[PDB]
Amino acid sequence: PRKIEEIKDFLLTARRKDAKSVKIKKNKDNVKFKVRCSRYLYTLVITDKEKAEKLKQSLPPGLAVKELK
Amino acid sequence: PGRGAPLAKVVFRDPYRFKKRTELFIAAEGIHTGQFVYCGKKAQLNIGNVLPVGTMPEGTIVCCLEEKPGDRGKLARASGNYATVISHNPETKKTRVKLPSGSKKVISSANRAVVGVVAGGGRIDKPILKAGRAYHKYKAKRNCWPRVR
Amino acid sequence: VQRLTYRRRLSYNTASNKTRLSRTPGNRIVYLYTKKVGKAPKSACGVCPGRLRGVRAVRPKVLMRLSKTKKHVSRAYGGSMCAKCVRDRIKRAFLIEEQKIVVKVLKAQAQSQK
Amino acid sequence: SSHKTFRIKRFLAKKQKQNRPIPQWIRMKTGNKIRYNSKRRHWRRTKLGL
Amino acid sequence: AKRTKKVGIVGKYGTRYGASLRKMVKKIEISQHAKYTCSFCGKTKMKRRAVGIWHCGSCMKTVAGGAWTYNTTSAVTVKSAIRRLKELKDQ
RNA sequence: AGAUCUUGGUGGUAGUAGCAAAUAUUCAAACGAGAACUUUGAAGGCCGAAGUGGAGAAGGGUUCCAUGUGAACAGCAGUUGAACAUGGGUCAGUCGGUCCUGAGAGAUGGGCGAGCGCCGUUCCGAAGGGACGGGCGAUGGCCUCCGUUGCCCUCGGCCGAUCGAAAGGGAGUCGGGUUCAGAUCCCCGAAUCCGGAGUGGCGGAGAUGGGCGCCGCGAGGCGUCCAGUGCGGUAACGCGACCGAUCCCGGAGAAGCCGGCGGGAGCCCCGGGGAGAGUUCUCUUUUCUUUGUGAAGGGCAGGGCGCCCUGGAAUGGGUUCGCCCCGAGAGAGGGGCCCGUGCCUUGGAAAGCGUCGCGGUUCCGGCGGCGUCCGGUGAGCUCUCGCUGGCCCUUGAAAAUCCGGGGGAGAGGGUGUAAAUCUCGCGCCGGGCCGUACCCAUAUCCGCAGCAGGUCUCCAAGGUGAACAGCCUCUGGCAUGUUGGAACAAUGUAGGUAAGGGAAGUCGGCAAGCCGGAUCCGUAACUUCGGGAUAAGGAUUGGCUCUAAGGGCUGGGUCGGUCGCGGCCGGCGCCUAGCAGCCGACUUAGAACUGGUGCGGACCAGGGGAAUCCGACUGUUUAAUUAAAACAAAGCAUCGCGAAGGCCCG
């Protein structure tokens, strides 16, 4: 697994050809966006909620957007 | 293992191709790592040098003597032992030497030898004191030690 | 307390059968079979006993999948010889060539007389 | 043992296959003279050749 | 305090092997386990590694010496004789 | 009629010997024709972590699992079975084999031999069949240009086939779930190694800057010329790549035994907070159970360094449990590197677990709520890592395999949105063959057998205690070892006690008994001066209540002269015989009180002395009647031998 630090890297990681799906996990303290690529699972951790929602609407289409709750 | 004499790993240069040649000389006492040894007819009289007996003086003593002119060392190889160059005759190219047993041997003047005494000192001075020490001594050599009368 | 079993069919405490204790997310203790401890290179001088610095100490076949930088030092003989003996060899080379020059000049000035 | 070679495993497989009773309809054949499998082997009574 | 009157290093052998044999092996063991002054680096770190092999801890110099002493009197006289014969041979 | 005749059968013995090694069973119920033995529940016990527990190697070969039967077998029985019968079950790139070599085995050449053959393993061989390099060509063909192929030149000693380890070397898989029986193999989820990519998969690097003429208000554009096989740090060395062949050098693989310390983990222990149980005759905020985070990345602690820079030390200093270290560069200050199995983070809570509930899919990886917390300890035990020593007439593998360096033969482009090249990031494809069930032993192996024998390992809790001792207990397991019941004769086998005497017994103190731990004293002759020696001999030992001693962490300010009831400098003061607070193990010594003088209360646990003989000692020996004074041994002495040799095989 790999941990993506900022938001732009997660965006162009999700826009990759081998990105199978993304899973959104809502924890008590943060929200984790996990994109399943060919080799690694890339996790982006968002501490607040408004930015997580903005990322939710800014995810690219044509990709599974599975919610884990 | 099995011998009391230390061995000297000595590296030479190959004269005909780009390579390093490693030898396993019998260490004459006094030689040390990082020392230059010289082997040949024109080598000087120093401890560890190898040079023919015919080029050596009438009282020098030697370490790893050749029995025949051209084989490697064969005589005075055991630790603490040495041979002595007694006499020469330039005609017939012969040199008389004294062996560790005290016998006198006439060899060719082209036989090479190491100057000095072989290291390993008076190893037989120390009493073994223990059947176990004798067992460990001969375990590294061969199956001969516990000797039934 | 919980007692452990080997997870493979090698049942002897050999050098290749070394384990360490691990607590799984299932809250149990298991053996994890460790890898052998690697060694850093020794200096090609063969004199000073310390092992080289700046080189990752791994098993020999692991070096095949390491990058070049992880296996050497940015210096002449880097990753093969130590810095101290490299300096000694530089000085020794220069000084011996200087001595050759000196003896050449000495014989050239000595041959002036028949 | 658990570690075994393919040839040993095949030998044991054949022994397992041929260690079984005779079919019931054999005794109904004309001039059978066979009552039971006299070559039956038990793993604890008699041991295999290997 | 002084722990033994006379046995010294061969007190490890107990009452065994005979007093004369223990006395004979005593000086050899003392010389065997003694640390000699290295003639290359000057430090007192030259000690025996195996029989006939003497290694210095500091300068990492290995020397071929005697079995129980760093050098034997035989070898010392031999070295002096070889030097004398070399200087007699050349002129 | 005989041959201790051969083969087969049958008696008495005789319903006899016997079914007695390792403490132990009891009650109720179910199934069933039938219960001392099966199953379930309750109770009482045992193994007591060096196990009667949990898993393997060899060996076995289906004994494994489910169902059914009650013929024979399980030396009583059986409703049970390792029996019988019918079915089922062993899933791998990353667990092994496979590969490497070891001790060794063994072809070829050669030699011998009547001969099958056997000697030999580098020796009496023309023993390299390979190579990115260059040339000569066939254009085979997307004839640009690189891939084919034949020959020549150059280079090329594993100098020897081959086999040899399921414990040696050897890249890389972990967590959860799942079956009647399989899982590191299946499913789910996270990775990872090796190999391949010719038509080049995507990026990034190489690598894209200066000079001069001009245009242009400046900025910036045009032309030309010249560079450009990366960069930083004094250094140790660092950064994401970082052209490069034959050849050469080096490293890793790759190293004994023992000691003493230190770091880390797991377990153990203590104080709380939860959740569920247990006791409650009285007491007990109590007793018990439980209270996770894999590999692989990133970051940070921590450990180590015989690594670097400044500097130059005697009034020598630093420093360890011990050591040891220093003008060949101490102490001090500042850095660098390695390991990082510890912590945090991605994995990750969605899983797991504990509880409390709710639906049903005859048999749901069902659904939901809550929780999975905070600390402290240590000569503790076990692994592991590291440091530093000791011992050796003992110096404790090899090879596959992988890597670094030296050198610079060559290759690449003419300033292009460029080339050769890339050990950097991501992406694409593949990993074949064989083994895999189970037992691993007082019942799955060998001993004719379910035989008190034998058979190689791993893990390892609480109390007592020096302790992996013995004794008791928890987890786990079992049913007393191929039968039960009733009695309690002799004789036995095993274990105890015995007044008075104390070896009078006997070949002989055989056997048994005495002593025994720890603390404090005190110890002879003799001696090879090391020992003898726990010599001998004596005293004490419980419980309870105290008293002393042996440590670790922080903070010690004289103050608003002021504003980042708080901070920068300073007029602003003397813990300097060290204080104040907090926390913490065990251990030792002393005292009082006290019990019917009993206290190493069980367990554990030397009888001693004076001599003679032999062997010096430690060691070894007649497996199955001799363990010895026999053998060995160090020490001593003698003999042969300088290799065309001594001794020995053939």
Add this chain to the structure above:
RNA sequence: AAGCCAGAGGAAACUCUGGUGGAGGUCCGUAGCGGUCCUGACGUGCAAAUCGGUCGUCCGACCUGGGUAUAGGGGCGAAAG
């Protein structure tokens, strides 16, 4: 045991005392290995050599698995045919 520290006494040579250290085919004693005595048990045995207690040794000439080598007038033997 060596090595080391401190104190003290000595003109020196050195000596004495207290610590430290942890050697040894060292001692007691588990496991292991062995097999002394009871001339115990058993002796149509559990066993074609076992069992109980008591014992020897237990850092080394130690114990042990697997792989190898030596084959019958031959091997191998710390030696008892």
